[PDB]
Amino acid sequence: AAELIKYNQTGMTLNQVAQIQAGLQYKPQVQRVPGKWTDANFNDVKHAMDTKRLAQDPALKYQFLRLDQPQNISIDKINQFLKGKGVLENQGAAFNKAAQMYGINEVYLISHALLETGNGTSQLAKGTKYHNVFGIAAYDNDPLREGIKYAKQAGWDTVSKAIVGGAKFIGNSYVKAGQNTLYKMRWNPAHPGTHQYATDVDWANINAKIIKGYYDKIGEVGKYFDIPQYK
Ligand SMILES: [Cl-]
Ligand SMILES: [Cl-]
Ligand SMILES: [Cl-]
């Protein structure tokens, strides 16, 4: 209703910040066609980074949405969206709960739950059964039994429960270390070339697309934004 946007003027310049990306040892990629990367040129990075262009686009501005800020989306609105999503069908309540506890945007938490469980169909989320809607301890030895093992250990015997305990894990490493918007996660304006999430120059733009997609399904729009400014 009343978007609240904060603008941080580095006083720097897009020309400076983009060439800085080009000197990184972990060189940037460009999926000109899906499934294949190539290093991006100065224009490729300067365009993908140009917040002036990303702020004007309704799907692209979501990279500036603050992920560390819960929005009070109605729990009913959430279930209308979680409907039919395998397990997780209900419990937007368990989700609003994980959101207010850790101070983290709700859509960021749910899309993350949706990816790890394949929209509620993952065996780990499927769960007598213990559950895991966040892939906790699942990227190492045995993703299925090792994760079932974690969930069994913390009492995630029910879906609202796997959601509460898995939630503390989301955003500590990125959203809580200051990279609170998909743009900061990609370009890191406080420390450029530092702690960046991926080489693809389109990574905040793609993720902004999927987020705004969930916002539209859900029935809401973002309210807290943060746009870096170069001049
Ligand atoms: Cl702030
Ligand atoms: Cl397994
Ligand atoms: Cl994170």
Author numbering: 1 to 231
Task: Show me the paper's own sentences about this structure.
AtlA-gl crystallized in the P6422 space group with one molecule per asymmetric unit. Its R-domain comprises the region from A1 to D68 and A190 to K244, whereas the L-domain comprises from Q69 to K176. The AtlA-gl structure was solved by molecular replacement using the SagB structure as the search model. Thus, the packing of the R-domains and L-domains in the AtlA-gl structure differs from their packing in the AtlE structure even more than in the SagB structure. In the AtlA-gl structure, the 4th turn of helix α13 is stretched out compared to the slightly longer equivalent helix α15 in SagB and the even longer helix α12 in AtlE.
Hence, for AtlA-gl and SagB to cleave a single glycan strand, both of their domains have to slide together into a closed conformation as observed in the AtlE structure.
